[PDB]
Amino acid sequence: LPFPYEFRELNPEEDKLVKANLGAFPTTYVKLGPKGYMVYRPYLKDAANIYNMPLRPTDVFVASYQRSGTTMTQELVWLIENDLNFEAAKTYMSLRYIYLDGFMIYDPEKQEEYNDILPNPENLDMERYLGLLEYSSRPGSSLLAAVPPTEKRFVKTHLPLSLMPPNMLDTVKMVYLARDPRDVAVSSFHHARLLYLLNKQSNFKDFWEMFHRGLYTLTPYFEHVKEAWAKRHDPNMLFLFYEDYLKDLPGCIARIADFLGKKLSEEQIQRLCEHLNFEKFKNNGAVNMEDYREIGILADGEHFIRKGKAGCWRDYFDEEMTKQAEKWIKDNLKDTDLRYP
């Protein structure tokens, strides 16, 4: 099948704002498709393959706009399918799942320019850093197609449905997570700091201006969410809210199990709840990506697992931003049944 989408460079306005947040970063963006989803330029080379990637009936996807609960979900989804074999779940998350669109943030043609954004390049564990770059060159598709049939595939992605095989849900199951845009904005701001993506200069307002305006990775934020929303009625789609994980974890697990075709006992659902305790998770080496810190590519004072709180966007928004945020979220939920807890 051919890729039904074209792309356009950013116009002056758009580009001006973006460079005000990610100027220092080597990878540039491009608007893909009619909705103009923001994708790192490299994505283009594999775009068509992903659109046509061969799916398998046993494939399980954990999708979401980034920073909405992907990690928590992957861990639960993995345990449930592998009969709560906590022992075997101790291997790195990035090894148990395939991050479909995780490659695009790296542009090989710019290797040199990358370490320059690191406070200290002379202190990198080169044997590892370089290996990271290599893996990060392998297109998403290739990594999926490499897994033999006798191995269940666990895919992770922040790609909207429109960029993946349409009708895919006829073959694979997916769990899409969503979270309050505002809290997502915040978490993303810090995550971008974690990997040295933002000009050490700019602040959060700048980031937010870029975010709700559809100029950040994989946004427009609402089109992304709405796409999965419209498919929640499907038997292979499970739409969840990050807020509910905090409100009723025991009940969220139940739903997932029921969804993935399992039956956990009060004990299993409970046994999983303790395993997902924030502090216990935040310190879990298999899922906190802290191994990366050894490499030398994580910012001091940042962590892949931060607070795990809800509604703390209020500590970052000023009255001005707050109004503009309300109007924005208000305007995208008009004439749609999409509602956040």
Ligand SMILES: Nc1ncnc2c1ncn2[C@@H]1O[C@H](COP(=O)(O)O)[C@@H](OP(=O)(O)O)[C@H]1O
């Ligand atoms: N076990 C857990 N329980 C609650 N929140 C968790 C969690 N593990 C990670 N998180 C939170 O989930 C967000 C990451 O989302 P994702 O995995 O999709 O990128 C972060 O939000 P915060 O930045 O608000 O802390 C992170 O701290």
Ligand SMILES: CC1=C(/C=C/C(C)=C/C=C/C(C)=C\CO)C(C)(C)CCC1
């Ligand atoms: C390879 C590579 C990098 C690291 C990418 C990482 C660490 C990705 C994992 C991201 C996650 C897990 C969050 C989204 O779900 C950085 C940007 C340093 C610069 C250059 C090459």
Ligand SMILES: [Ca+2]
């Ligand atoms: Ca350098």
